Amino acid sequence: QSDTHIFIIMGASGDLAKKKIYPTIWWLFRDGLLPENTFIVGYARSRLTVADIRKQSEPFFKATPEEKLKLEDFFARNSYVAGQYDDAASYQRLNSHMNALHLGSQANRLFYLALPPTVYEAVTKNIHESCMSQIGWNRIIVEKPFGRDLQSSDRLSNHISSLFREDQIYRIDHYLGKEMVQNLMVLRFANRIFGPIWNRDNIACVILTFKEPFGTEGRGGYFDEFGIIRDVMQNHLLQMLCLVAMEKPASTNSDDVRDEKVKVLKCISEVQANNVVLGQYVGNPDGEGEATKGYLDDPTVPRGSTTATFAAVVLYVENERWDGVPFILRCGKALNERKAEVRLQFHDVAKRNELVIRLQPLPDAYERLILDVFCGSQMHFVRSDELREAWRIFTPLLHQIELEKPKPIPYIYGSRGPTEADELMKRVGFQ
Amino acid sequence: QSDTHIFIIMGASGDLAKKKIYPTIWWLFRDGLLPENTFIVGYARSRLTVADIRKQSEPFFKATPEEKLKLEDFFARNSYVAGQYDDAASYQRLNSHMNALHLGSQANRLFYLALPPTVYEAVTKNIHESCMSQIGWNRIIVEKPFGRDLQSSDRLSNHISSLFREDQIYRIDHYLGKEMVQNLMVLRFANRIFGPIWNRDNIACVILTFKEPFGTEGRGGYFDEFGIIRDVMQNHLLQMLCLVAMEKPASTNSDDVRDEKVKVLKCISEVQANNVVLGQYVGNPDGEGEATKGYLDDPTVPRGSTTATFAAVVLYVENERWDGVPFILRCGKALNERKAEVRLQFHDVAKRNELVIRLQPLPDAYERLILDVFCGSQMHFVRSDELREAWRIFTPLLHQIELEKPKPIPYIYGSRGPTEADELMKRVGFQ
Numbered sequence: 110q111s112d113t114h115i116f117i118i119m120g121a122s123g124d125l126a127k128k129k130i131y132p133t134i135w136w137l138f139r140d141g142l143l144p145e146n147t148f149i150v151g152y153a154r155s156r157l158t159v160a161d162i163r164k165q166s167e168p169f170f171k172a173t174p175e176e177k178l179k180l181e182d183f184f185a186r187n188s189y190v191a192g193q194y195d196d197a198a199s200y201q202r203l204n205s206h207m208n209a210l211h212l213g214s215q216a217n218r219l220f221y222l223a224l225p226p227t228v229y230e231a232v233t234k235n236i237h238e239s240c241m242s243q244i245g246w247n248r249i250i251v252e253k254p255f256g257r258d259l260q261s262s263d264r265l266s267n268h269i270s271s272l273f274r275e276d277q278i279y280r281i282d283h284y285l286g287k288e289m290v291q292n293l294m295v296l297r298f299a300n301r302i303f304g305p306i307w308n309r310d311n312i313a314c315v316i317l318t319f320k321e322p323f324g325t326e327g328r329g330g331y332f333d334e335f336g337i338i339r340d341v342m343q344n345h346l347l348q349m350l351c352l353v354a355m356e357k358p359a360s361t362n363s364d365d366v367r368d369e370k371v372k373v374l375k376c377i378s379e380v381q382a383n384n385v386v387l388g389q390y391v392g393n394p395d396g397e398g399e400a401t402k403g404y405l406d407d408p409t410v411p412r413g414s415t416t417a418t419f420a421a422v423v424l425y426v427e428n429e430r431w432d433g434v435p436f437i438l439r440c441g442k443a444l445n446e447r448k449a450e451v452r453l454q455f456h457d458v459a460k461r462n463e464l465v466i467r468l469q470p471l472p473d474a475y476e477r478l479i480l481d482v483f484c485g486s487q488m489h490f491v492r493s494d495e496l497r498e499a500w501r502i503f504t505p506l507l508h509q510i511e512l513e514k515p516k517p518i519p520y521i522y523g524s525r526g527p528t529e530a531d532e533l534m535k536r537v538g539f540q
Numbered sequence: 541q542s543d544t545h546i547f548i549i550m551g552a553s554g555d556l557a558k559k560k561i562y563p564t565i566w567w568l569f570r571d572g573l574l575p576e577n578t579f580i581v582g583y584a585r586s587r588l589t590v591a592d593i594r595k596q597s598e599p600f601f602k603a604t605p606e607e608k609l610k611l612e613d614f615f616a617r618n619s620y621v622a623g624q625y626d627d628a629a630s631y632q633r634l635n636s637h638m639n640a641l642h643l644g645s646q647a648n649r650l651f652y653l654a655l656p657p658t659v660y661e662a663v664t665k666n667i668h669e670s671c672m673s674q675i676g677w678n679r680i681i682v683e684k685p686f687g688r689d690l691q692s693s694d695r696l697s698n699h700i701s702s703l704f705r706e707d708q709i710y711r712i713d714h715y716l717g718k719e720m721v722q723n724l725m726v727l728r729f730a731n732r733i734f735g736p737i738w739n740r741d742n743i744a745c746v747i748l749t750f751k752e753p754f755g756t757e758g759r760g761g762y763f764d765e766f767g768i769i770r771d772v773m774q775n776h777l778l779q780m781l782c783l784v785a786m787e788k789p790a791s792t793n794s795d796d797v798r799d800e801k802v803k804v805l806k807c808i809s810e811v812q813a814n815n816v817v818l819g820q821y822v823g824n825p826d827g828e829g830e831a832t833k834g835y836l837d838d839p840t841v842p843r844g845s846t847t848a849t850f851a852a853v854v855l856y857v858e859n860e861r862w863d864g865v866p867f868i869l870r871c872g873k874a875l876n877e878r879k880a881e882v883r884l885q886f887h888d889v890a891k892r893n894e895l896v897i898r899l900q901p902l903p904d905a906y907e908r909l910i911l912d913v914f915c916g917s918q919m920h921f922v923r924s925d926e927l928r929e930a931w932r933i934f935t936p937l938l939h940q941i942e943l944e945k946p947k948p949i950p951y952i953y954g955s956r957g958p959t960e961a962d963e964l965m966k967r968v969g970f971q
């Protein structure tokens with residue numbers, strides 16, 4: 110709206126804020142990519158000073174001796190407020206502190222919630238009641254997990270989207286590599302180019318693979334409460350499926366592209382277990398290092414955990430551009446390669462031919478997302494109906510897994526996954 | 541037409557016949573890919589016996605002790621006739637010998653002319669006058685060089701196509717690797733698939749590269765009388781250009797596809813020197829082996845030879861599907877890699893994106909060509925009008941090179957070629 114912005118890191122004492130948020134905002138400030146009149150205000154329960162945050166986080170800054178002066182400037186633009194997350198007086202203190210800044214009463218306010226969603230219901234309330242700007246815009250950045258299933262995610266999203274408009278909500282997702290946004294971009298451009306030929310007449314099968322060669326790196330405790338379907342598939346792989354199967358948008362507006370994405374999502378039926386192959390990785394005896402340890406050998410993983418580290422799922426877009434064309438989402442950890450690609454196999458009319466869009470592996474994709482929040486571009490942020498459709502697609506399966514607890518097929522650290530995945534792929538027609 | 545075939549190797553005493561024709565026909569016979577009643581009759585001036593040809597050529601057969609009996613069968617189906625190439629009595633002796641074979645009077649006759657084209661005018665005459673079958677078909681296989689320019693090639697082709705119909709002429713080309721026919725096949729299938737999007741609206745530039753890492757291997761004497769444009773470009777690279785830029789054929793008939801190829805060729809104007817970059821490779825001082833020797837260090841190359849071992853040429857198809865779209869044919873020997881690929885760059889409407897068809901590097905492509913001659917498929921054999929159009933496109937440039945003798949830019953053994961080639965590519969718009 111104007112020239113003055115306030116970046117409010119809710120929960121600045123956190124681990125995400127220490128290791129990623131503060132270093133990323135510092136890199137954006139140093140490279141001159143933030144607005145010139147930007148203030149950063151941390152807010153949390155820990156009674157901290159800006160010097161405490163500096164000591165905690167500057168090790169992660171890439172702080173070189175040549176950059177001292179603008180680093181001191183950046184930290185001069187920092188302040189911190191201690192307060193509770195459901196205390197109205199604390200939020201009033203925060204609002205007064207923000208108003209006391211230079212043109213803080215007219216400044217745009219970017220709240221970013223480096224907090225567990227368990228407190229979101231409180232925070233989003235108090236903000237909406239005490240800290241929104243009357244003149245500049247107000248944009249909120251929420252973090253994963255966007256709920257756990259259709260029900261919890263609807264509860265959280267209906268609460269948040271009862272206090273803020275959709276163009277104020279930014280559901281950020283940025284944990285799958287520094288090339289994510291660019292991968293989605295090349296897939297959208299490929300959809301624009303190859304659109305006229307991506308039909309059920311030419312295409313016989315599409316895959317989307319997300320491959321990782323390392324395991325949970327002794328962090329399986331956090332991964333255990335989510336699973337590989339929640340971690341990679343119902344958010345990222347499904348979103349590139351949308352980008353592949355979508356119709357041409359009405360324009361280049363972010364909301365038109367997201368409209369076409371949700372229009373695709375509303376054509377996918379609810380996946381069932383007979384189209385799913387789950388898998389868990391075991392230690393490799395002949396390997397060395399972390400390859401000798403399996404998933405259950407992780408000390409943070411509870412004994413008897415049946416959560417999958419590998420998933421192969423078959424979906425179907427049910428319109429008359431794609432009908433009976435199987436979309437095979439295959440992803441997993443502790444595999445043979447670090448690969449992310451989409452490949453479309455054609456109908457042989459003459460072996461079978463494929464078109465392969467390989468994806469990686471300047472603004473590092475996470476810096477690009479913060480910059481997009483600053484600019485107002487919502488294209489790489491999932492919409493409420495988009496998220497609801499994803500959860501609707503994947504919720505009955507997840508409920509069945511949580512209820513019946515089936516053992517997912519074992520596969521060795523460094524393999525390609527269980528052979529049953531290949532059997533399913535070839536049963537739905539893959540060659 | 542029936543079950544009996546006679547394979548007449550004109551000039552069986554030759555080097556091509558010893559090193560390639562006889563071993564290939566033996567491999568086709570051993571694998572059971574020839575017709576069951578097939579005879580092989582060599583014909584040449586050297587007064588030889590079948591045992592002489594056996595001793596000469598079996599070293600190249602991959603003759604294993606397990607294959608002795610069918611090898612003896614194959615050689616039992618061989619005979620040889622000594623005669624002159626313009627002696628009517630010798631051709632009458634050959635015709636009588638062929639008639640004396642089992643059902644030779646009704647057999648199909650496949651004449652394949654392992655001779656320098658300098659004698660073709662004689663041979664093709666006498667055959668047409670003395671050795672054609674009255675019942676079975678008669679098919680002729682002619683070898684490179686199909687002339688030298690528009691004039692010599694028209695003379696030779698008008699002579700040959702005054703005695704045989706087009707479906708009896710097979711201009712074979714098979715010296716660029718064992719994957720040629722399959723490369724052309726995948727390019728045709730890519731034309732069928734990506735047709736609707738290969739326009740001047742989406743495409744901004746096409747390249748076609750033929751790259752070789754080794755030099756003339758001390759055989760520059762033969763290469764010197766032709767050049768890299770005659771060796772690779774006016775035959776193979778131009779033909780895949782045709783396969784890329786062509787319209788959809790009326791059917792899958794070989795003649796419809798060749799019709800579309802010649803329809804494309806008749807839209808390319810005559811290339812001029814300001815769109816051409818020629819180059820010659822020199823020895824690499826820091827390398828080892830044949831990389832230390834250049835082109836002129838080849839003892840078979842005449843001193844002062846200005847023939848190019850590298851060429852970068854820009855062509856334009858001039859219809860309204862492609863208009864102003866530059867087709868950049870880039871090829872050369874003694875480079876950094878063994879690559880053959882086509883790549884099409886799209887118009888950036890958002891860096892620039894490309895669609896890459898990489899080409900290699902069962903029936904080895906040369907065996908496939910002999911089998912196609914046996915079957916009557918002429919699709920991988922250039923037609924008379926196709927060859928005339930290629931020569932018309934490239935003849936004024938070749939005449940200018942032969943007349944003015946410009947020095948082609950020097951490039952080091954193992955490089956990518958002269959930088960002037962990149963300058964030209966980027967001047968016509970390549971990024």
Ligand SMILES: NC(=O)c1ccc[n+]([C@@H]2O[C@H](COP(=O)([O-])OP(=O)(O)OC[C@H]3O[C@@H](n4cnc5c(N)ncnc54)[C@H](OP(=O)(O)O)[C@@H]3O)[C@@H](O)[C@H]2O)c1
Nearest residue numbers: 120122123124125153154155223224225226252253254284
């Ligand atoms: N792969 C992923 O999906 C992934 C990875 C990393 C982070 N995240 C998300 O990013 C956000 C930031 O996570 P984080 O690693 O920074 O979390 P964190 O370690 O929990 O701490 C962030 C701050 O939240 C406050 N806090 C934590 N638990 C609380 C509780 N139960 N009640 C009240 N306040 C509490 C603390 O501040 P005070 O004690 O000073 O109040 C803490 O410093 C979370 O929403 C997390 O889900 C997701």
Ligand SMILES: NC(=O)c1ccc[n+]([C@@H]2O[C@H](COP(=O)([O-])OP(=O)(O)OC[C@H]3O[C@@H](n4cnc5c(N)ncnc54)[C@H](OP(=O)(O)O)[C@@H]3O)[C@@H](O)[C@H]2O)c1
Nearest residue numbers: 551553554555556584585586654655656657683684685715
């Ligand atoms: N890269 C290429 O383009 C390439 C490579 C290899 C071959 N070729 C073509 O393949 C064909 C076969 O070549 P090749 O290597 O086998 O040739 P070759 O070494 O010349 O011999 C083939 C036979 O032709 C006869 N002959 C040769 N020169 C003659 C002449 N001046 N007058 C009359 N008869 C003559 C000889 O048989 P007799 O003495 O018993 O009569 C000789 O054994 C040629 O047309 C050649 O151009 C092309």
